[PDB]
Design a protein around this ligand. Structure first.
Ligand code: HEM
Ligand code: HEM
Lengths: 164, 164
């Protein structure tokens, strides 16, 4: 960068392909486990270093957990609890009101990995679920703090955690 | 986006090409005027809706105005005041230290439009300078709050303003 120079157009980071879970996940896990999963993720979050991002206030966060759970149940192939009640996901946009940097996503993911184990999510559909949130979560990042692309964490990296 | 769906890869917004000013800018304006331009731009910034982002302490304020003026003088073709002191520009990275959303860039730009007129920046190189900051400023944005791309402000939209 100096006088006269030309900087070509460039992109910061690409939002990778997102594979939504097949209906096998809803069938293997069932609605009750899915809802419990989200509740435990939320509990993990409230104990995490990003607890401050989350409305504290029983009514506030009881409605939030319910919403997230409806979203997860529907997207894993259950009934349309979410779109019948909130409509179009438009998730990135819904997250604009909260500051989400790269570290925030990693902690959100780590809390989810722990919840997946804590609730004994069936191993057979675990990768389908993981690869969904691992990639989808990248699109919620709205505060950049590095030139590096957001970290990828493939199931292969964490699978040993679920058999130990 | 639903169970089984595959959202393909995508980018948020492109950093468009940036044309840095030719040395003609420094030749036409001179070091004094470029430093006054930066000084005035900062006076405007302190009176603007992003005033909170900038220092209140007089010593810190002087330091930053100096760095920006050194950068502008150098980048317009003057002596290398910035690289000799602060070193490599890496401007996007240096700006991670402050939260900059789309509106912040718009306000920073409108403050610059007024400064440029206020100090009677030479008409021969005004467009060259404007197109540099209008595009370069896009790469400073590190907080996204909309799905829309950052607003483009071509010189043609504002050219009448400079001439009355
Ligand atoms: C990337 C890290 C993420 C963080 C830190 C995060 C945090 C949050 C916070 C703080 C809210 C509440 C916003 C409010 O109170 O208005 C929220 C809303 C929500 N989040 Fe996330 N989130 C993340 C990613 C995701 C991902 C990947 C999904 C889905 C797979 C998701 C699903 C939801 C849903 C369904 C809601 C409620 C939306 C509604 O009200 O309709 N989030 N999130
Ligand atoms: C787009 C909206 C922008 C905003 C809101 C903004 C604001 C700021 C702030 C708050 C600082 C001090 C940061 C700190 O020390 O913590 C700073 C530093 C600086 N800004 Fe910007 N800026 C913007 C764009 C630009 C552009 C486009 C340029 C150059 C064309 C620029 C040139 C500089 C320079 C040279 C510094 C000093 C860097 C150093 O410490 O060496 N800024 N800016």
């Amino acid at each position: 960068a100096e006088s006269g120079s030309i900087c070509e157009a460039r992109i910061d980071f690409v939002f990778p392909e997102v594979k939504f879970p097949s209906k096998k996940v809803y069938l293997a896990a069932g609605e009750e486990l899915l809802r419990k999963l989200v509740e435990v993720h939320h509990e993990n979050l409230m104990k995490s270093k990003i607890h401050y991002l989350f409305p504290t206030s029983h009514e506030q966060l009881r409605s939030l957990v319910k919403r997230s759970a409806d979203f997860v149940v529907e997207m894993c192939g259950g009934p349309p609890y979410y779109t019948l009640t909130r409509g179009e996901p438009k998730m990135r946009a819904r997250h604009f009101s909260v500051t989400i940097d790269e570290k925030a996503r990693e902690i959100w993911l780590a809390c989810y990995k722990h919840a997946l184990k804590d609730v004994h999510f069936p191993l057979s559909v675990l990768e389908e679920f993981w690869q969904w949130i691992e990639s989808f979560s990248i699109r919620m990042i709205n505060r950049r703090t590095t030139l590096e692309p957001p970290r990828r964490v493939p199931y292969s990296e964490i699978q040993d955690f679920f058999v130990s």
